[PDB]
Design an enzyme around this catalytic site. Structure first.
Site, short mmCIF file in Angstrom:
data_model
loop_
_atom_site.label_atom_id
_atom_site.label_comp_id
_atom_site.label_asym_id
_atom_site.label_seq_id
_atom_site.Cartn_x
_atom_site.Cartn_y
_atom_site.Cartn_z
N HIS A 14 21.72 79.99 156.18
CA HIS A 14 20.96 79.04 157.00
C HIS A 14 19.52 79.53 157.00
O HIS A 14 19.21 80.62 157.52
CB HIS A 14 21.52 78.90 158.42
N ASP A 122 22.65 69.36 156.29
CA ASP A 122 21.51 68.65 156.89
C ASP A 122 21.74 67.16 157.13
O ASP A 122 21.54 66.66 158.24
CB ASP A 122 20.22 68.86 156.07
N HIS A 300 17.08 67.13 149.44
CA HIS A 300 16.70 66.52 150.71
C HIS A 300 15.28 66.81 151.17
O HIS A 300 14.84 66.28 152.17
CB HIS A 300 17.68 66.94 151.82
#
Ligand SMILES: [Ca+2]
Length: 833
Positions: A14, A122, A300
Site C-alpha cells: 500500500h 482503488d 488508474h
C-alpha cells in the site's frame, strides 16, 4: 461462553510522481519484500499487488534476482497476478480488459504461479462474467458479498480495508488489537477475520498477538487460504451491475488510445488471422509486445490524464510505438493476403486493388482508394525531372471494373504526384484517389476491383444536397442547416423531427484534471445566435457534405485570481475566480457528411485551441424527457439515470429513446457525456485546465490542450425501441474503416471475392478475431447486446466451430454446444480448429 475467531493477517503493498521516480521506489519495495522472504522462515507470503508487470519492471533493473524471484513464486511465498497491469477499467476498450487478463494469465503460467483472486485496491457491470471467463471466481475490493453481472453470473467479493503502526509493548498492543478487531468484526459475517497488512517486523508482532488473546488466533496468511476458509462458513449480501471528468481530461490521450485499440483489435488482428490461412504463421510474439506496450498506458493514474506532465508525454511515445507495430503487422498481413489473391482475371494494363471488411458488420460507405497510376524509378532520370514529367503529364480518364469485367460507378477525387519507395528502390509515382460506393458489404470478406483506362461510369440519381437552401436528403433523413449552423433533421420513416442539434457550448473550467468546475457567475457561450458561414463542399448522387464555420468570442483564460487559488490550494468549490474579461475570436469548423445508403450523419469538428481554463461541448437536444438513457460500456449497453452536473463515461455511443423514437450519438475517443434534464445529449469535445488537483498543488500546463484538434462523432435516429441495436452496430462499424490495398496482376490460390466468416445477424457486438498462442486456432469473440436468448451460428467458409471457449481461450465449464442460442448478455468466444 465465547466462540473462537481466526484473524488472517495478509501482507501486501500500500503505497503525482514521474514514471521513473515510482520505478526506482518499486525496486526498493521489492528488495525488502524479497529480503524478508529469504531471511524470515515464519513469513508466510507477500501479495504482489495483482499485476505481473511488477516482476518485469523489477527484473529489467535487477535481472540477477530472477532466480530468487522464481523460487519465491514457486514456493507460494510471492503471490502474483492475475492481471498484467492494474487497469483504469471504465476508460479502456472491452478487449483491453480481456487482454489484460489473458496476458496476466499466461505470464502467471510462465512463473508456475497458480491463479490469484482479481484484485481491485482503488477502483463495469460485466466484471462477474469476465472473471468467471478468466477463472477468477473471487475478487478483493479496497465485508463480504456476492456481485452479480447482467448475465446473472455471480462472483464472491471481499470488501477489505486497511484499518509498523503495531506497537512492541503488551499494554499498547492489547488496546491496539482490541480496537482493530472491533473494526473488523463490525463488518465481518463469519468468525474468519481478514486483517490487511500494508507495507512501505511482522512475525514478531503476530506472535505477541497470539500470546494476548485466548479467543483469537492470529495467523500470517494469504488470500488463497482465507478464501477457502471463509467460503465454507458464509451465511446474505448481494450487489448488482455497476469524477467522470477524467473521461475528458486530455482528450488526445483518449483519441490515441481509441486509435491503437481499434488498430490492434479491428485491423491488424483479423488480417493476420486471415493471412495465416495462406502463410502458416501468425505473429503471436509481436502482438503480445504491442498489447503490453499499449496496456502500460492503462493504469488508474495514467489514461485518465489525471497525473503529471512528464507521465503523459511518456504515454505518447508508448502510443506511437504500439500503433507502429500495429501498422507493421497489418501491412505484412495484407501484402501476404493480396499476393495470394488471383488477379490474373483483370485485363492486362489494369491496376488491381482489394477492399476488406475487417469488421463483423454489414458495412456501407462511400470509400476512397488511392491507386498508383504510373511509376518512374530514380534510375530513369534526375528525380526532379521525373517529378515534373508526371506533374505536367495530363491524366487519362479511368474506369473501375469488377472481376467479371462489369463497370462499377466511381469518381476521381484527386491526383497526386510524389516520391515513394518499396523493398525488399526509390521512385516518383502518380496516384489517383477513387471514390467508390459500398453497400452492405458482408462482414469479414473481400472484393477485388481494378482501375482501368476508359470512361468513368458516373454515379446516377438526384444530387443528395440542394445548396441553395443548405439542405440535403436521402430516403432515411432530410437535413436543414440553419443560419445558426445548427441542424434540424426529419426522420423520413418515423416522421419525428429534431431541432438545435450540433449547438456548441463553451464554459469556464476552474477545476482540475479530476473534476470540472464552472466559475460561479459564468452563464456560458453558445453558437445559437451566431451567424454561420455554410458552404456545400461536395454534392453527388451518393455523397454530400457541408462545411460550417463559427466564430464565438471567448474569454482568453480565467482571470488573475485562478493562479493564486491554485497556489494556495483553495478548494475548487470555494473558488472566486471568473472567466477573464479579455475575449478573442474562437473558430469552430465542422464537416457534416451524408451518404445515399445510410441514415448516419458524420461530423468532423476542428479547432486550434489557443485559450485556457475552459470546456467545449456539442449539444444534441433530443426533445424527449426521460429518467434514463443508455450508454455503451463494457461488453454491454447499460441503462443509467440522467455538484449540479452529472458527467458520465461512454464508449462508442450514448442513446436516448422513447416508445416511439430514439437518437444515437456515437464518437471516437470522446468519452464524457451528460444527458440534461430537458433531454439534451451533450458530448464533451475538450476540457482545458491548469492543475492536477487532489491533495496539493501540481501545475500541469500541458493539460490545457493547446493546438489543433479534430473530433469525430455522429448521429443516428431510430423508431420503435428494437431498432436501437442496429444503430449501435453501425456505430461500431463506423469506427472501423475498410482496408484498401493495391496489387499487381498475378495468379493466385485465392478468390477475388470471398467471405471468410459468415456471421449471424441480430443484436451482436463483434469484438475479436485473432489466433491462439501456440495452437494457432482461430479465435472469434462477440457479445449479446440484449436481455434475450438469441439464435447465433458462426461459420468459417463452410466449416462450423469446434467448441465454445472462455476468454483465456479454454473450453467452457461445462461444455456448451456451438449450435446453442447466445444467452442474455453472453460474451461468447468461438474456437475454430
Ligand atoms: Ca491466541
Amino acid at each position: 461462553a465465547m466462540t473462537k475467531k481466526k484473524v488472517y493477517i495478509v501482507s501486501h503493498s500500500h503505497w503525482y510522481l514521474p514514471y521513473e521516480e515510482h520505478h526506482m521506489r518499486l525496486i526498493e519495495l521489492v528488495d525488502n519484500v524479497l529480503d524478508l522472504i529469504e531471511n524470515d522462515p515464519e513469513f508466510n507470503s507477500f501479495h504482489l499487488d495483482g499485476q505481473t508487470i511488477i516482476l518485469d519492471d523489477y527484473l529489467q533493473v535487477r535481472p540477477e534476482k530472477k532466480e530468487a524471484v522464481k523460487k519465491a513464486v514457486q514456493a507460494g511465498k510471492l503471490k502474483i497476478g492475475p492481471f498484467y497491469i492494474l487497469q483504469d477499467d471504465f476508460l479502456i476498450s472491452s478487449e483491453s480488459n480481456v487482454r489484460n487478463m489473458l496476458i496476466g494469465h499466461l505470464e502467471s503460467q510462465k512463473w508456475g504461479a497458480p491463479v490469484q483472486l482479481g484484485y481491485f485496491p482503488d477502483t463495469m457491470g460485466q466484471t462477474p462474467q469476465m472473471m468467471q471467463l478468466a477463472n477468477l471466481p473471487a475478487a478483493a475490493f479496497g465485508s463480504e458479498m456476492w456481485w452479480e453481472g447482467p448475465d446473472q453470473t455471480k462472483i464472491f467479493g471481499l470488501l477489505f480495508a486497511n484499518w509498523n503502526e503495531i506497537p512492541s509493548e503488551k499494554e499498547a498492543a492489547i488496546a491496539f488489537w482490541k480496537q482493530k478487531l472491533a473494526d473488523v468484526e463490525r463488518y465481518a459475517s463469519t468468525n474468519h477475520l481478514l486483517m490487511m497488512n500494508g507495507v512501505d517486523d511482522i512475525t514478531k508482532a503476530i506472535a505477541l498477538a497470539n500470546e494476548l488473546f485466548p479467543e483469537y488466533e492470529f495467523i500470517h496468511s494469504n488470500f488463497d487460504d482465507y478464501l477457502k476458509a471463509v467460503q465454507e462458513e458464509l451465511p446474505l449480501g448481494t450487489v448488482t451491475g455497476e469524477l467522470a471528468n477524467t473521461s475528458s481530461a486530455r482528450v488526445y490521450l483518449k483519441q490515441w488510445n481509441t486509435k491503437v485499440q481499434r488498430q490492434l483489435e479491428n485491423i491488424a488482428e483479423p488480417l493476420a488471422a486471415m493471412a495465416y490461412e495462406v502463410t502458416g504463421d501468425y505473429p503471436h510474439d509481436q502482438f503480445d509486445y504491442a498489447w503490453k506496450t499499449l496496456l502500460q498506458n492503462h493504469p488508474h493514474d495514467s489514461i485518465c490524464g489525471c497525473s503529471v506532465d512528464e507521465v503523459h508525454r511518456g504515454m505518447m511515445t508508448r502510443f506511437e510505438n504500439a500503433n507502429d507495430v500495429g501498422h507493421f503487422l497489418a501491412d505484412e498481413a495484407t501484402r501476404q493476403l493480396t499476393e495470394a489473391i488471383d488477379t490474373s482475371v483483370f485485363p492486362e494494363k489494369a491496376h488491381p486493388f482489394v477492399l476488406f471488411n475487417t469488421s463483423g458488420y454489414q458495412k456501407t460507405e462511400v470509400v476512397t482508394v488511392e491507386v498508383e497510376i504510373e511509376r518512374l524509378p530514380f534510375y530513369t532520370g534526375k528525380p526532379e525531372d521525373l517529378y515534373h514529367e508526371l506533374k505536367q503529364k495530363a491524366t487519362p480518364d479511368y474506369q473501375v471494373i469488377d472481376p467479371t469485367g462489369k463497370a462499377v460507378a466511381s469518381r476521381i477525387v484527386k491526383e497526386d504526384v510524389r516520391f515513394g519507395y518499396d523493398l525488399p528502390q526509390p521512385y516518383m509515382a502518380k496516384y489517383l484517389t477513387v471514390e467508390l460506393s459500398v453497400k452492405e458489404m458482408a462482414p469479414f470478406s473481400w472484393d477485388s476491383f481494378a482501375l482501368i483506362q476508359g470512361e468513368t461510369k458516373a454515379f446516377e440519381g438526384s444530387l443528395l444536397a440542394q445548396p441553395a437552401t443548405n439542405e440535403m436528403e436521402n430516403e432515411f433523413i432530410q437535413v436543414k442547416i440553419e443560419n445558426n449552423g445548427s441542424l434540424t433533421i426529419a426522420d423520413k420513416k418515423t416522421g419525428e423531427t429534431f431541432s438545435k442539434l450540433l449547438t456548441f457550448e463553451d464554459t469556464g473550467d476552474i477545476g482540475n484534471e479530476y473534476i470540472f468546475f464552472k466559475p460561479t457567475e459564468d452563464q456560458g457561450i453558445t453558437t445559437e445566435n451566431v451567424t454561420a458561414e455554410i458552404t456545400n463542399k461536395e454534392n453527388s448522387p451518393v455523397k454530400a457534405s457541408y462545411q460550417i464555420k463559427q466564430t464565438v468570442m471567448l474569454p482568453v483564460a480565467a482571470d488573475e485570481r485562478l493562479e493564486e487559488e491554485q497556489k494556495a490550494v483553495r478548494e475548487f468549490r470555494e473558488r472566486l475566480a471568473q472567466r477573464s474579461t479579455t475575449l478573442r475570436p474562437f473558430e469552430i469548423t465542422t464537416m457534416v457528411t451524408m451518404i445515399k445508403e445510410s441514415n448516419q450523419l458524420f461530423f468532423e469538428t476542428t479547432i486550434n485551441n489557443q485559450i485556457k481554463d475552459h470546456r467545449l461541448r456539442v449539444l444534441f437536444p433530443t426533445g424527449m424527457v426521460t429518467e434514463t438513457h443508455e450508454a455503451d460500456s463494457i461488453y454491454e449497453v447499460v441503462t443509467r439515470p440522467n455538484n449540479p452536473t452529472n458527467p458520465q463515461h461512454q464508449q462508442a455511443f450514448v442513446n436516448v429513446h422513447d416508445q416511439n423514437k430514439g437518437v444515437t450519438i456515437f464518437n471516437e475517443g470522446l468519452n464524457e457525456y451528460e444527458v440534461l434534464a430537458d433531454g439534451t445529449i451533450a458530448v464533451t469535445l475538450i476540457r482545458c485546465v491548469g492543475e492536477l488537483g487532489d491533495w496539493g498543488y501540481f501545475a500541469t500546463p500541458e493539460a490545457q490542450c493547446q493546438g489543433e484538434y479534430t473530433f469525430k462523432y455522429g448521429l443516428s435516429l431510430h423508431g420503435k425501441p428494437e431498432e436501437r441495436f442496429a444503430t449501435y452496430q453501425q456505430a461500431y462499424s463506423a469506427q472501423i474503416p475498410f482496408t484498401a490495398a493495391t496489387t499487381a496482376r498475378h495468379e493466385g490460390k485465392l478468390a477475388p471475392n470471398h467471405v471468410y466468416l459468415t456471421t449471424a445477424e441480430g443484436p451482436i457486438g463483434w469484438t475479436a478475431v485473432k489466433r491462439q498462442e501456440q495452437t494457432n486456432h482461430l479465435v472469434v469473440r462477440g457479445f449479446n447486446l440484449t436481455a434475450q436468448n438469441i439464435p447465433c451460428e458462426l461459420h468459417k467458409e463452410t466449416q462450423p466451430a469446434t467448441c465454445l471457449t472462455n476468454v483465456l481461450e479454454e473450453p467452457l465449464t461445462p461444455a456448451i454446444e456451438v449450435d446453442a442460442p447466445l444467452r442474455p448478455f453472453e460474451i461468447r468466444t468461438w474456437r475454430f480448429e
